[PDB]
Amino acid sequence: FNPYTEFPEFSRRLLKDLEKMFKTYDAGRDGFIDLMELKLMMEKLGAPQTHLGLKSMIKEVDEDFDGKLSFREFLLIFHKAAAGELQEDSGLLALAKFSEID
Ligand SMILES: [Zn+2]
Ligand SMILES: [Zn+2]
Ligand SMILES: [Zn+2]
Ligand SMILES: [Zn+2]
User: Fold this and answer.
1) Planar angle of CA 90, 41, 81, nearest 5 degrees
2) Residue 2 is part of which domain span?
3) 19 CA distance to ligand 4 centroid (A)?
4) Which ligand has an atom closest to residue 35 CA?
5) I need a labelling partner for 99 at 20 to 30 A (CA). Which of 39, 54, 66, 74 fits?
6) Number of domains comprising the chain
């Protein structure tokens, strides 16, 4: 995976900022954000989600079907947000807006 060629619209600074926030919420340090870690992240950002809501959020970008977010799927959230590809009521749009990145 090459984030610079996959997401050339992201500055190096934004990529580093997104890596930092991925690592912040991967509490278990396994390289993924699972449902429980996303639950905690959404609470901390000020947009708590239901259990099924969190599952729907992950499913939107879960390209390898494992029910958790890899770093490349996390970046995809922000790519979709900036490209106008998330619905106005998606928990993913709340995640991107309330992350206070950019
Ligand atoms: Zn994890
Ligand atoms: Zn749950
Ligand atoms: Zn469940
Ligand atoms: Zn996944």
Assistant:
1) 35
2) 1-102
3) 16
4) 2
5) 66
6) 1
